Amino acid sequence: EVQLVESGGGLVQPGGSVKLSCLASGFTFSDYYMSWVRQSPEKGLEWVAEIRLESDNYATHYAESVKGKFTISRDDSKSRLYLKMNSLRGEDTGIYYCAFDVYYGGAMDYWGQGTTVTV
Amino acid sequence: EVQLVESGGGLVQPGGSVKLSCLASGFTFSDYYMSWVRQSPEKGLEWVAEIRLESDNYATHYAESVKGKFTISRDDSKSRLYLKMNSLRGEDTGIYYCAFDVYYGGAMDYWGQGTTVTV
Amino acid sequence: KPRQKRTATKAYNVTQAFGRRGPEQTQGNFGDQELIRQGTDYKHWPQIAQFAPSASAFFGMSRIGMEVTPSGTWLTYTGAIKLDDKDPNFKDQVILLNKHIDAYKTFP
Amino acid sequence: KPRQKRTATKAYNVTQAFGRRGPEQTQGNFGDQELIRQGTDYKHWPQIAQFAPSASAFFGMSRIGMEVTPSGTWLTYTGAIKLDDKDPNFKDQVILLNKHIDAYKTFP
Amino acid sequence: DIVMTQSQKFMSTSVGDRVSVTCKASQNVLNNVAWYQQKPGQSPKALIYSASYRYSGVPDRFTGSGSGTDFTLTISNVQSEDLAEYFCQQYNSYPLTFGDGTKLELK
Amino acid sequence: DIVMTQSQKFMSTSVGDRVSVTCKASQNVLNNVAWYQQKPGQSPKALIYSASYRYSGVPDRFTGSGSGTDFTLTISNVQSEDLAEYFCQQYNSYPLTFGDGTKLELK
Amino acid sequence: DIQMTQSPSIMSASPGEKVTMTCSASSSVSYMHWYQQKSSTSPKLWIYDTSELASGVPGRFSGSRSGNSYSLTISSMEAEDVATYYCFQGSGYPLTFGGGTKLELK
Amino acid sequence: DIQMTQSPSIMSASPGEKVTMTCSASSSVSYMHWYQQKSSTSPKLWIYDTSELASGVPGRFSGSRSGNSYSLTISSMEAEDVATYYCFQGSGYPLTFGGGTKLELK
Amino acid sequence: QVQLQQSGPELVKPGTLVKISCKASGYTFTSYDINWVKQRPGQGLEWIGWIYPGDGSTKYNEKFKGKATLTADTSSSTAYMQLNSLTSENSAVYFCARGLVGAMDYWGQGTSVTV
Amino acid sequence: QVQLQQSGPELVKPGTLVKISCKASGYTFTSYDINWVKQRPGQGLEWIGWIYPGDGSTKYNEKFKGKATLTADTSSSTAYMQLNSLTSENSAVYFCARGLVGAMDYWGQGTSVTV
Structure with a gap:
C-alpha cells in the first residue's frame, strides 16, 4: 500500500541549485512526517532534516552540518516533498533518501529508492 | 489465636461510676486499635468510642450522645482496655462488647463475650 | 529521569519516550494516531x-x-x-x- | 471523589478507602502492618x-x-x-x- | 479509505418480532462503529454508540453486537414507531463513511 | 512470636566443594529473610538480603534460595576465608528473632 | 453529621424466596460494612466492603452499591438466616450503626 | 548536542561465532535503534526500542543496554549477515547516526 | 437540553457563494466538536468535516477539500459553512451535528439548498 | 565509606546504670535506623530495638521492655543505650548496627559489658 519514489537529481555544477522531489502514493500524506538522509562513501549516513505536519504551522528543523543551503517544503495537495538546495559545495556527493515512519517518532521503516547527486 | 474476655459489670445506682475491663491474650495488643459497642433491647447497637495506638499520644475519639461521662484509657503493659463511666442515666442499660479489627479500620471481626450493666 | 515518570508532550512524542506500540507484553497498547503525536496537548x-x-x-x-x-x-x-x-x-x-x-x- | 484518585493518610486509613486487603482479584495486596495505618506518613x-x-x-x-x-x-x-x-x-x-x-x- | 457496505436495501417485517440487520466493514475497525436511525423527512437521531452501548432517551430492545468486521443491530418487539432508515458509521480512520441505508418496513 | 529453627549446630566440609545449610521457620515469613556471617572475634557483616540478593562486597560464591519456610543458602566453593559462623533472620513480624547459630569447619 | 436509616423494619420471609434489605446513606461513606447478630450471641461480620462475603459464610448473600443506597440481596431463605442484620459505616470518625432489620418466616 | 561513536569499525567474523557491536552514546538517549544497509540497496530497520526485532528479522539478533552503552549481539554468524550496521538516536531533534560497523568474514 | 438551530431553506443561482449557519446553545461551546454532513436525495450520507471552536482545527475529507470552508464564532456559539462548487451536483440537504471524536450525539433540523 | 564507631569495653558494678555510645558518619543520619542486638558468650543473637532519629520512634522487643532505653542525638549522629536491669545475667557483648526497616546493612564493632 505504501511506496515512495524520489527523483530530480543529476549533475550539479559547484555552487548551483537543485530541487529534489519525493512523491508518495497509497496513504494519507498529510498525516505523517518525513525526513531526508544522505549517503556518502566516506561519512556514511548523516541526517539532513525533517518536517512536521500542517498543524504546527509547518514546523521545520534542520541539522547543524547544513543549517542554511537547504530548505524542506511540503505541498499537501499534490502530495510531494521538496528539498531545495543552494550552493552545493564539493562535499555533498552521493545518494539521498527520503524516509518516514508510521509511529510518529524516529524509527524510519519506509525508505525509498535513492536520488544520485554529484558535484 | 485471639480470645477477648471482658468483665467488671454489675448493678449500679443512678449517678454512680463503674469500670469495665477487657483483657486480651494471644496477640500483640500494643499494635491494634480497639473500640466499644453497646446494645439495648430497644435502640439496637450504638457506637460508644474507640482508642488509637501509642504513636498518636494515645489519641481518643468518643461518640456524640456519650461525648461526656465516658473515658477510654489503655495500659499496654498488662494488655487491657479500661472504659470508665460516670453518672450513668437510665439510657445505659444492656450489654457492652469489646471489638478490634486486624485490618486497621472499619470491619470489626474479633468480638468478645459481653458485659451486663443495669441501672 | 526514570522511564516511569516521564511526561509526553509535543517534544517527547509518546512513541519517543514510551517506545513503539505493539503486541508484546512490555510494549504499550493504548493510543491512536492523534494521541501519539500531540501528547498531553491532545484536546x-x-x-x-x-x-x-x-x-x-x-x-x-x-x-x-x-x-x-x-x-x-x-x-x-x-x-x-x-x-x-x-x-x-x-x-x-x-x-x-x-x-x-x-x-x-x-x-x- | 472517585476511587482511583483518593490519597490515604492517618485519617483515611488505606483499608478504610481502598478496601480490605485480601486474595481476591479486585482487592489489593500491598502494605505489611504499617503502611495500611500511617499511609503517606509512612517514614x-x-x-x-x-x-x-x-x-x-x-x-x-x-x-x-x-x-x-x-x-x-x-x-x-x-x-x-x-x-x-x-x-x-x-x-x-x-x-x-x-x-x-x-x-x-x-x-x- | 475504509468502505462500509450493507445489503437488503429494502427489508420489511412484522410488528412485535425479532429483526436484525448486518453491516460488514472492509478494513478492520476494532469496535468503534455507531448505529443511527432517521424517520422520513426528519433529522437523524443517535441510536447506539461503541457498537454495544445505548444513548439516553433511546429505548430498550435496541441492542448491538460485533467486533472487527461484522457489526449487527438487533431490534426486538418492533412497534409502529420504527418505520425508518438505519445507518452505520465508522470512526477508526478519517475519512468517515455512513453506509448506504437500511429501510425497515412492514408486511 | 515467631521461632526460626536451624539444625546442624556443627558442620564440616572440604575446600572448594559445595556446602549448604538449612533454616526452617515456624510461621510463614514470605520471602523476607536475610543471612549474615561473623568470623570469630570480629563483628558480623551482611551476606544476603531478601533471600535471593547479595550486598556489595560479598563474593559471588555465595548464593541463596527459598521461599515461605525452607530458606537455604549455598556456597559455591569453600575457601580459607569462609571459616566463620552463619545466621539467618526473620524480617517480617516485629519480634525480629535472629536464629541460633551454625558453623562451617574443615575436615 | 451523618444519619443512616434501614428501610424495612420487620420484613417477613418464606423459604426459597428472595430477600432484599436496604440501607440508605446521606453521606459519602466509601464502603458500607455489614454485620449480623443472632439471638443471645456475639455479633459476626458478613459483608466486608459492600460486595465481599465474609469468612465462613454461605454464598447466598450478595451486596450492591446502587448509588448512595446500599442493599443486601438474599438469594434463597433458609432456617439459618432468622436473625437481626445491621449496616455499618467507617469512613468518617463519628461511626454510626443502622437500625436493624428483623427477618422472620411465614 | 549529542555525539556518538561505534567502537568496532571493520570487525571480522567466522560462521557460528558470536559477534558483538557496541554503540556509545551520551545521556537522554531514550531508545537507540539499529538499522542495516547492504550493498546497493535501501536501508532497512532491524532493531527498535533496543529490544524488539523488526518484521522479518531472524531471531538470531538481540539488543542490550549496559548503562549509557548499547550493544548488538549477533548470536551466530550466517552468510546472510554480511552488511553495514549503524546506530540511530531518536530523542533529541538534532538526530545523529553512528559511524557504522562493516562486518566481514574470515 | 441540547439544541442546534440551523437556518432555513436557501434557493441560490449557480456559482453564487452560499453561507449556511448553525447556532449552538445549552452546552459549553468549547467542550465539544461540531461536524457537518450532506445527503443527496436518494443517495446515502457522506462526511464533510468538523470544526472545534478551540485552536480552530479543521480536518476536511479528501473529496471536499477546497469545496467547503468551515468557520467558528465563539461570541454567539455559531458555526457556519461556505460552499463554492454549486454545480447542480450538490443539490441536497446538509446537517450540522455534534460529536466527541466523530460519533454523532445530537443533530439539528438542517437546511436545504437548491441550484 | 560508611562506618559506625562504638565505645570501648566497660566493667561495672551490679545495679549501676550503663550507657553505651554509637557514633555514625558518612551517612544521612535521618535516612536509616540504628538498632541494637545482644550476644551472650555461647548463646545466639537476639533483638533489642531500633530508634529513628527523625520521629524519635522506638519499638522494643517484649523481653527487654522496661530494661533498656534508647535515645537519639542528631547533633553528632550518635545514639546511646541505657541498661538499667543489669544484675548478673548480661555479661555479654552489644552490637550497634544499621539498616532499613527489617534487614541489617553494614554493622559496627560493638562493645562488651561484664559485671
Missing part, C-alpha cells in the same frame, strides 16, 4: 486523564508482584478500575477509551 | 512512591483493556516497570518491596 486529554491513578491509589488498588529473571527484576501490576454508570459523562468516556484502546492494529 | 514512603506512574505513564505503558459484564464496565491494567541495578538505592528498594507485597497472609 480531550483531561476527560481520559480522570482515570490516571494517584501516587497512593496505584499502590492501594492494584495487585503488585515481583518477577525476577536473569534479565533483571520487574514489578508486575494488575489493576481494575470501575467506571460510574450514573454520571452524565458516561457517554463521553466509553467512546474515548474505545477509539484509542488496541488501535495499533489499524495503523498502515 | 519510608518516597522511596516506594518513586515507582508510582505519572498521568502520562499509566496510559503510556500499561496494556489497557475494557471488560463488560452485567455488573458494568471495568478498565483492566496490566503493566511492568523495570528496576535498575546500578544505582545504589537498588539495595534499598528490593527490601521494602518484598516486605510489603502479599503481606495479607501474615496477619493473625
Whole structure:
C-alpha cells in the first residue's frame, strides 16, 4: 500500500541549485512526517532534516552540518516533498533518501529508492 | 489465636461510676486499635468510642450522645482496655462488647463475650 | 529521569519516550494516531486523564508482584478500575477509551 | 471523589478507602502492618512512591483493556516497570518491596 | 479509505418480532462503529454508540453486537414507531463513511 | 512470636566443594529473610538480603534460595576465608528473632 | 453529621424466596460494612466492603452499591438466616450503626 | 548536542561465532535503534526500542543496554549477515547516526 | 437540553457563494466538536468535516477539500459553512451535528439548498 | 565509606546504670535506623530495638521492655543505650548496627559489658 519514489537529481555544477522531489502514493500524506538522509562513501549516513505536519504551522528543523543551503517544503495537495538546495559545495556527493515512519517518532521503516547527486 | 474476655459489670445506682475491663491474650495488643459497642433491647447497637495506638499520644475519639461521662484509657503493659463511666442515666442499660479489627479500620471481626450493666 | 515518570508532550512524542506500540507484553497498547503525536496537548486529554491513578491509589488498588529473571527484576501490576454508570459523562468516556484502546492494529 | 484518585493518610486509613486487603482479584495486596495505618506518613514512603506512574505513564505503558459484564464496565491494567541495578538505592528498594507485597497472609 | 457496505436495501417485517440487520466493514475497525436511525423527512437521531452501548432517551430492545468486521443491530418487539432508515458509521480512520441505508418496513 | 529453627549446630566440609545449610521457620515469613556471617572475634557483616540478593562486597560464591519456610543458602566453593559462623533472620513480624547459630569447619 | 436509616423494619420471609434489605446513606461513606447478630450471641461480620462475603459464610448473600443506597440481596431463605442484620459505616470518625432489620418466616 | 561513536569499525567474523557491536552514546538517549544497509540497496530497520526485532528479522539478533552503552549481539554468524550496521538516536531533534560497523568474514 | 438551530431553506443561482449557519446553545461551546454532513436525495450520507471552536482545527475529507470552508464564532456559539462548487451536483440537504471524536450525539433540523 | 564507631569495653558494678555510645558518619543520619542486638558468650543473637532519629520512634522487643532505653542525638549522629536491669545475667557483648526497616546493612564493632 505504501511506496515512495524520489527523483530530480543529476549533475550539479559547484555552487548551483537543485530541487529534489519525493512523491508518495497509497496513504494519507498529510498525516505523517518525513525526513531526508544522505549517503556518502566516506561519512556514511548523516541526517539532513525533517518536517512536521500542517498543524504546527509547518514546523521545520534542520541539522547543524547544513543549517542554511537547504530548505524542506511540503505541498499537501499534490502530495510531494521538496528539498531545495543552494550552493552545493564539493562535499555533498552521493545518494539521498527520503524516509518516514508510521509511529510518529524516529524509527524510519519506509525508505525509498535513492536520488544520485554529484558535484 | 485471639480470645477477648471482658468483665467488671454489675448493678449500679443512678449517678454512680463503674469500670469495665477487657483483657486480651494471644496477640500483640500494643499494635491494634480497639473500640466499644453497646446494645439495648430497644435502640439496637450504638457506637460508644474507640482508642488509637501509642504513636498518636494515645489519641481518643468518643461518640456524640456519650461525648461526656465516658473515658477510654489503655495500659499496654498488662494488655487491657479500661472504659470508665460516670453518672450513668437510665439510657445505659444492656450489654457492652469489646471489638478490634486486624485490618486497621472499619470491619470489626474479633468480638468478645459481653458485659451486663443495669441501672 | 526514570522511564516511569516521564511526561509526553509535543517534544517527547509518546512513541519517543514510551517506545513503539505493539503486541508484546512490555510494549504499550493504548493510543491512536492523534494521541501519539500531540501528547498531553491532545484536546480531550483531561476527560481520559480522570482515570490516571494517584501516587497512593496505584499502590492501594492494584495487585503488585515481583518477577525476577536473569534479565533483571520487574514489578508486575494488575489493576481494575470501575467506571460510574450514573454520571452524565458516561457517554463521553466509553467512546474515548474505545477509539484509542488496541488501535495499533489499524495503523498502515 | 472517585476511587482511583483518593490519597490515604492517618485519617483515611488505606483499608478504610481502598478496601480490605485480601486474595481476591479486585482487592489489593500491598502494605505489611504499617503502611495500611500511617499511609503517606509512612517514614519510608518516597522511596516506594518513586515507582508510582505519572498521568502520562499509566496510559503510556500499561496494556489497557475494557471488560463488560452485567455488573458494568471495568478498565483492566496490566503493566511492568523495570528496576535498575546500578544505582545504589537498588539495595534499598528490593527490601521494602518484598516486605510489603502479599503481606495479607501474615496477619493473625 | 475504509468502505462500509450493507445489503437488503429494502427489508420489511412484522410488528412485535425479532429483526436484525448486518453491516460488514472492509478494513478492520476494532469496535468503534455507531448505529443511527432517521424517520422520513426528519433529522437523524443517535441510536447506539461503541457498537454495544445505548444513548439516553433511546429505548430498550435496541441492542448491538460485533467486533472487527461484522457489526449487527438487533431490534426486538418492533412497534409502529420504527418505520425508518438505519445507518452505520465508522470512526477508526478519517475519512468517515455512513453506509448506504437500511429501510425497515412492514408486511 | 515467631521461632526460626536451624539444625546442624556443627558442620564440616572440604575446600572448594559445595556446602549448604538449612533454616526452617515456624510461621510463614514470605520471602523476607536475610543471612549474615561473623568470623570469630570480629563483628558480623551482611551476606544476603531478601533471600535471593547479595550486598556489595560479598563474593559471588555465595548464593541463596527459598521461599515461605525452607530458606537455604549455598556456597559455591569453600575457601580459607569462609571459616566463620552463619545466621539467618526473620524480617517480617516485629519480634525480629535472629536464629541460633551454625558453623562451617574443615575436615 | 451523618444519619443512616434501614428501610424495612420487620420484613417477613418464606423459604426459597428472595430477600432484599436496604440501607440508605446521606453521606459519602466509601464502603458500607455489614454485620449480623443472632439471638443471645456475639455479633459476626458478613459483608466486608459492600460486595465481599465474609469468612465462613454461605454464598447466598450478595451486596450492591446502587448509588448512595446500599442493599443486601438474599438469594434463597433458609432456617439459618432468622436473625437481626445491621449496616455499618467507617469512613468518617463519628461511626454510626443502622437500625436493624428483623427477618422472620411465614 | 549529542555525539556518538561505534567502537568496532571493520570487525571480522567466522560462521557460528558470536559477534558483538557496541554503540556509545551520551545521556537522554531514550531508545537507540539499529538499522542495516547492504550493498546497493535501501536501508532497512532491524532493531527498535533496543529490544524488539523488526518484521522479518531472524531471531538470531538481540539488543542490550549496559548503562549509557548499547550493544548488538549477533548470536551466530550466517552468510546472510554480511552488511553495514549503524546506530540511530531518536530523542533529541538534532538526530545523529553512528559511524557504522562493516562486518566481514574470515 | 441540547439544541442546534440551523437556518432555513436557501434557493441560490449557480456559482453564487452560499453561507449556511448553525447556532449552538445549552452546552459549553468549547467542550465539544461540531461536524457537518450532506445527503443527496436518494443517495446515502457522506462526511464533510468538523470544526472545534478551540485552536480552530479543521480536518476536511479528501473529496471536499477546497469545496467547503468551515468557520467558528465563539461570541454567539455559531458555526457556519461556505460552499463554492454549486454545480447542480450538490443539490441536497446538509446537517450540522455534534460529536466527541466523530460519533454523532445530537443533530439539528438542517437546511436545504437548491441550484 | 560508611562506618559506625562504638565505645570501648566497660566493667561495672551490679545495679549501676550503663550507657553505651554509637557514633555514625558518612551517612544521612535521618535516612536509616540504628538498632541494637545482644550476644551472650555461647548463646545466639537476639533483638533489642531500633530508634529513628527523625520521629524519635522506638519499638522494643517484649523481653527487654522496661530494661533498656534508647535515645537519639542528631547533633553528632550518635545514639546511646541505657541498661538499667543489669544484675548478673548480661555479661555479654552489644552490637550497634544499621539498616532499613527489617534487614541489617553494614554493622559496627560493638562493645562488651561484664559485671
